[PDB]
């Protein structure tokens, strides 16, 4: 019976491959052979947010486009004022081996998590005036790669146990568990409508999950190694991934297939982070060659280079007004570009 | 400034002070992974050091050997996340010399050749050597197929083969030891290896080597 089911699975995979080959009427590059390139976009360091004592592993902007939570391996989680380079908060973490952070859309909460398999949610606005741990969320068998808030009482985690989780923060229990990955999940991004999300997971496969229903809505393939970064175009109907195979790729959910590959023959190091510009015209990608590049998303050419980091760029993020972009690298420095 | 910026600025400065006050401590802290390929040996060895000291996910253990802050990390596939440990001073690799070791050798080879671990030294503990001595003395199948040193030896030729096998998968120094059944001293013998490691790092940083 196992052989019969394996044959059925192979037939279904062949059907999916044929279906995705059908809709590929023309490559995305061909429809873009008439768009004005954006040229060389030279962004300078308006602010250098220094203070982290070790490698910065994650970063997140506020919805006010001014506050910024950065998170480093020394066990600290610092909230900066991007405009004035002011440290608003310094939250000491209980586990230093932490590899993600998030900033609540309402601004009342931040999130973090890592090798302790716990997603810690911190309350920023308390009467007592200190940032205390609102909740430790437990249940993941592996390490935690990324966490994002849908709202103040629902969070989403991805973990290196082939599993994502939607948590009700008040109760503390997994409201939904998303399974289906084979390898360790590395990055997830939430749609603007906060009803869907996407996940990359070390098996060169990405998955679009429905938060409410809980089932794997769609899958995508094409990469060659670990998928280390993922994000949505700023409308929730496209998403770009970066991998250790030194190749960024732009996928679309409705087309359900690969659309572009951002790569260069001189790019041999992997991709640690990706984030889109507000209009979607710029995809800023962080790399392990110490640099961060800026691709004209619609033309797959390199619009710019955000050089300035002496170690590997681990995180980057474009604000909600698109004003700046922040890059954090393993040099313990965070930098605001505009 | 509107003075509500000024106070704001002052707040940031205070935070900076605290972070600076920790930088010096972070440098003073010495990190050692514990990679042992098993569960019983690691438990026994950590139990011995915990007896010496007292007199979840990652299990960080914090101790002091000679008034030096020490953190032993003690965390299938281990490729992307297993890169945050490039900041550690050493990797204490505990394997038993009385149970054969192709898997231990292969894991060692994967560990040592990683660019993550280029600036990280390795301390090869070969424990349960009393068990190895007994296994050699009492008639038992001795290591073969390359052991051109005589199987029924007392204690030395088998040990030399084991180590010369362990120093061969290298394309920072690789220390090694033959601690006894549990042990009598273990902290002062890892302290030496970490001190030599940091001395060589300092010598390289002074372009003096």
């Amino acid at each position: 019976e196992l052989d019969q089911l394996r044959q059925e699975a192979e037939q279904l995979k062949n059907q999916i491959r044929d279906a995705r080959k059908a809709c590929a009427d023309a490559t995305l590059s061909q429809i873009t052979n008439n768009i004005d390139p954006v040229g060389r976009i030279q962004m300078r360091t308006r602010r250098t947010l220094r203070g982290h004592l070790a490698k910065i592993y994650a970063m997140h902007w506020g919805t006010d486009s001014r506050l910024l939570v950065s998170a480093s391996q020394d066990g600290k989680l610092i909230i900066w004022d991007s405009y004035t380079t002011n440290k608003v908060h310094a939250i000491p973490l209980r586990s230093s081996w932490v590899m993600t952070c998030a900033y609540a859309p309402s601004g009342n909460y931040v999130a973090c998590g890592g090798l302790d398999n716990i997603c810690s949610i911190y309350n920023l606005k308390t009467r007592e005036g200190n940032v205390r741990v609102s909740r430790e969320l437990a249940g993941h068998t592996g390490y935690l790669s990324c966490c994002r808030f849908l709202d103040d009482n629902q969070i989403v985690t991805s973990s290196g146990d082939t599993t994502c989780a939607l948590w009700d923060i008040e109760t503390g229990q997994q409201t939904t568990t998303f399974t289906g990955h084979t390898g360790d999940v590395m990055s997830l991004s939430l749609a603007p409508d906060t009803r869907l999300f996407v996940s990359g997971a070390c098996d060169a496969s990405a998955k679009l999950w429905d938060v409410r229903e809980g089932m794997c809505r769609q899958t995508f393939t094409g990469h060659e190694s670990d998928i280390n970064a993922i994000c949505f175009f700023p409308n929730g109907n496209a998403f770009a991934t970066g991998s250790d195979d030194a190749t960024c790729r732009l996928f679309d959910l409705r087309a359900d297939q690969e659309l572009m590959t951002y790569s260069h023959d001189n790019i041999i190091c992997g991709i640690t982070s990706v984030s889109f510009s507000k209009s979607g015209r710029l995809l800023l990608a962080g790399y392990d060659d110490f640099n961060c590049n800026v691709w004209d998303a619609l033309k797959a050419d390199r619009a710019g280079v955000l050089a300035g980091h002496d170690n590997r760029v681990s995180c980057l993020g474009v604000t909600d007004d698109g004003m700046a972009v922040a890059t954090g690298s393993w040099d313990s420095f965070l930098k605001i570009w505009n | 400034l509107s003075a509500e910026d000024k106070a704001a600025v002052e707040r940031s400065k205070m935070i900076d002070k605290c972070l600076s006050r920790e930088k010096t401590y972070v440098k003073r802290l010495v990190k050692i992974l514990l990679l042992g390929a098993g569960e019983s040996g690691k438990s026994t060895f950590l139990k011995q050091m915990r007896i010496i000291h007292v007199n979840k996910g990652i299990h960080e253990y914090d101790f002091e050997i000679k008034n030096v802050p020490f953190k032993m990390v003690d965390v299938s596939e281990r490729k992307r996340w297993f890169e945050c440990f490039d900041s550690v001073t050493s990797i204490l690799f505990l394997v038993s010399s009385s149970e054969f070791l192709t898997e231990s050798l292969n894991i060692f080879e994967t560990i040592v050749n990683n660019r993550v671990f280029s600036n990280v030294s390795i301390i090869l503990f070969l424990n349960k050597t009393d068990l190895l001595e007994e296994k050699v003395q009492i008639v038992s199948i001795k290591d073969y197929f390359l052991e051109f040193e005589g199987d029924p030896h007392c204690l030395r030729d088998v040990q030399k083969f084991l180590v010369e096998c362990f120093r061969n998968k290298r394309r920072k120094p690789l220390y090694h030891h033959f601690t006894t059944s549990i042990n009598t001293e273990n902290i002062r013998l890892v302290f030496r290896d970490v001190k030599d490691t940091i001395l060589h790092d300092n010598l390289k940083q002074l372009m003096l080597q």
Partner: single-chain antibody
Amino acid sequence: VQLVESGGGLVQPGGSRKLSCSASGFAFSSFGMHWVRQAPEKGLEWVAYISSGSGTIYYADTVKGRFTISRDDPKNTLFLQMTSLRSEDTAMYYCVRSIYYYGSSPFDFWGQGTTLTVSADIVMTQATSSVPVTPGESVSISCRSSKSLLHSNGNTYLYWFLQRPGQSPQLLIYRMSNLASGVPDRFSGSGSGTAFTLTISRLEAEDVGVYYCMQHLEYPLTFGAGTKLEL
């Protein structure tokens, strides 16, 4: 949160006194602290400010140098040391909590304070000392300033506080627009440089009392006479 102030009482002409505030239920070391006075039948007035880290210290120009401010963070106890107390110092003093970071809510908590009896700076006019109102009807209150408070950083630093009869003031409006925590959403207000009208839609009971308006644009912080909504 709880700021319990102690030390008040009656003093002879001259003399000295040491008022203190015990802080319980919050991170007192992270909070800047203020001393704010109020004459027995008059408006509020600012006395002093100590900052987080015991650094910045500002004084009221009226009695500056004659008193000092201090804090003891491990004991969470604030101090004001008054010296050479004349009759003009007869007021009820209140210890106020204010934290300064982006988006903070300065002057968010006030103690009950203690009485203390003895036997250029920006000016605000509280245009009216009283406004007769009927409960259930909307009310609006006027303060006029003698300088623009819209600083170049985009803020505006005027504050509205409410003293209900027999109580200590509670922050209604911080920074000329915003609303504090624990106050109903029916309170609001708007203005431009040197003019503001506070708005209370659906005036309920317990909203009787005096409304005060302050400038944290620079030092000193100046207070108006406060409008007394009556019912």
